[PDB]
């Protein structure tokens, strides 16, 4: 449908293949494209590499969709601009692989001070997880766990990081490039997608037998329910306006309790 859609469909057909042929190697074409894209900005646009590095996921399938956003047709707030991806100086999806899993893991090793040369995500990413632990304890153990209270508290934590770049009033967590790229509850939209796609991907890979029906449901989720056209109204588990309902609240408690809550990338 678009150049963004073309690469995704090719990767999805390649993933459906590798799963059938030999269960791939975790994510196989998603890993190649994630690393291909992740080596391109590192070599060619270090400011955009710095902007999105704290947001990359160890699940390369999740990283692929959070970076490309191939089904986003509404808005011009792509995480990485269309010019950098498909323009005359664009990536256009050309493979930049060799030792792909080695290359992917080495990307997380780059979350350091020297790479930025300062946000706490680059200086002390372990300390950022300490701050998010405090917020997690505050919401789940220091407040009422209600349909009325908990959804509002999750948005407030993302709100503080959005406009003040702080967690527990300690900052700066991210670069300002990263902050302005996550305006209007986009990070909460990213992190619910993390939690949802993580669960279905983990389930897909844990099963004995591969069935294309389950991989299609993951793709159907990213196309029709979380395409990226409108972040706050694509919120489901984390939407306070949405509060079957207690099943939804169950995933909210699990999301806060997960590492996808206020997600930040760390070396290991």
Residue numbers in the entry: 11 to 127, 139 to 264, 274 to 298
Question: What does the published report state?
Answer:
The causative agent for ASF is a DNA virus, African swine fever virus (ASFV). The polyprotein pp62 produces three mature structural proteins by the cleavage of viral protease pS273R, give rise to mature product p15, p35 and p8. Herein, we present the crystal structure of ASFV structural protein p35 (304 amino acid residues) and explore its potential role in core shell assembly. Membrane-associated proteins such as p35 may serve as a docking scaffold for the recruitment of host membrane and other components in the core shell during the virus assembly process and further stabilize the mature virion.
